[PDB]
Amino acid sequence: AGELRIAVESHTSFDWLMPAMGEFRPMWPQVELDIVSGQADPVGLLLQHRADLAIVSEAEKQNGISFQPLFAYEMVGICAPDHPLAAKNVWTAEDFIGETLITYPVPDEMLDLPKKILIPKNINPPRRHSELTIAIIQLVASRRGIAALPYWTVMPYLEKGYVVHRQITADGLQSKLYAAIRTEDTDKSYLNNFCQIIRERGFADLPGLSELEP
Amino acid sequence: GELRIAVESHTSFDWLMPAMGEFRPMWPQVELDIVSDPVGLLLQHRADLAIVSEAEKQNGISFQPLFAYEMVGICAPDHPLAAKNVWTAEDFIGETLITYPVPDEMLDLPKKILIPKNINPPRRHSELTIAIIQLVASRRGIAALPYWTVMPYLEKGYVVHRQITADGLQSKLYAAIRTEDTDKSYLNNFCQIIRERGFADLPGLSELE
Structure with missing residues (x-):
């Protein structure tokens, strides 16, 4: 079904992003998971086709990128x-x-x-x-x-x-917090499903969290 | 005095952080710090204690076994x-x-x-x-x-x-310090906390000699 190379802005995101990957994997055995590490501007890596999903702290509107709210x-x-x-x-x-x-x-x-x-x-x-x-x-x-x-x-x-x-x-x-993807990949079910897991896990496991709109 | 900790592996932090938490109230006068070979920094007077994976065996350095x-x-x-x-x-x-x-x-x-x-x-x-x-x-x-x-x-x-x-x-794992500082009570006390915490909280640990 495809590939999921995750780009992440903050080191703190990993704490909740790691169990979300653990939940995702068995549901989508065909999707090739990866973390883009070993840097720089995660939205920039999306445009360079180096990442497939980016976890960002701002939904600064721009061409060819769709922003999904997390928390x-x-x-x-x-x-x-x-x-x-x-x-x-x-x-x-x-x-x-x-x-x-x-x-x-x-x-x-x-x-x-x-x-x-x-x-x-x-x-x-x-x-x-x-x-x-x-x-x-x-x-x-x-x-x-x-x-x-x-x-x-x-x-x-x-x-x-x-x-x-x-x-x-x-x-x-x-x-x-927002999850960013290329406009072309907004038809991909697994990417929307990964964002669903993030929100589900976040609100259940993390205190002092609030909903946010696009 | 002062305690500037130099650490070889990223894994050491997991157990080194609660040890610092235990040390602090006992020694409020000792100025704690983490620096960024760790043995080299001791000799350059940049670190006061180094957490290393090997005890070999240089002039002016005393190695204390941890686990x-x-x-x-x-x-x-x-x-x-x-x-x-x-x-x-x-x-x-x-x-x-x-x-x-x-x-x-x-x-x-x-x-x-x-x-x-x-x-x-x-x-x-x-x-x-x-x-x-x-x-x-x-x-x-x-x-x-x-x-x-x-x-x-x-x-x-x-x-x-x-x-x-x-x-x-x-x-x-060994804790290294300069030979001059082997009279310092707090440095030996920090090594004591490490061993106490390590053997109590971490499984599959064995004593060194």
Whole structure:
């Protein structure tokens, strides 16, 4: 029936994207599954015919791409309990100044905090890169810097007293997740079926999730 | 003082992170950090403790044993390697090898098995174990990971685990520090937490000497 090469914007998506692939496989034994890793702009890989489905944080309208809504969630600021930012209930863009920002090794274009908060306010703190969330949590806990991760990701580490979560902006920082595919592939049943599994699994297994329209 | 941790394998983080969580309240004065050979960074005064897969044996470095565990070969249940109970170096030929994006020097399978036998299969890189398991399950290639790491993915029926070599592939883990710092109580205390946590939370672990 075809092939499914998945392109993914955020490292956090893997946590829920991996069991979804596990559910998909037996249902579609003919579809050749793959993850495009070993980079860059996932919508760009769709256009280059390098990926068949892309998990993105924005549905920025463009020719030859159809965007399907998945879910929305809150981005929470994290610091050690003994960090001066724990005292502040609602963080601001300016609170990130003078602090080391711990993020995944990806550019600001693919990160909701610098993109929506820091960049428009002319804020560029020194960066620190880590591929693992597990590693970001202990860097933050050891007072090596602060970070911004989804509420559901942070959730199990709050229960251990490693870090304290905080609201970013009075309005609140929110991530909107979409699954993007080429217009030509909108006739493919398995691609719509993979998006169905994602929404089913997400809402059932992840806390603090909200529906979003196209 | 200060504790800047240097780590050789991506797998160590799974057990190294809760150990840091246990350490912190006991030593509030010790400044913790993770750096990015780990033994080389100790000598350059860039790291204060290094988690390594081999204890050989240089001036100004003291090696403390942590634990040893088995490296198991993983493949999809339908893969032709599932049929083989004990894999050999030669079984890796013609197969795509899925590893962490690190050179063969820091990987026990190519280092101890593949390289000495003149075996170099096409590589595939992934930072996440979660991602390696689904690539293997989707028949994108085969992998070699610790038994404890693979353990939760075996019940789910994604992959099957097999023995590498008749002898068996084993990883020996050590915590390395500078000889000067062997008087520091917190460094020995961090190694104590690692061993305590490891033997209690991880299956298929054995003591080193």
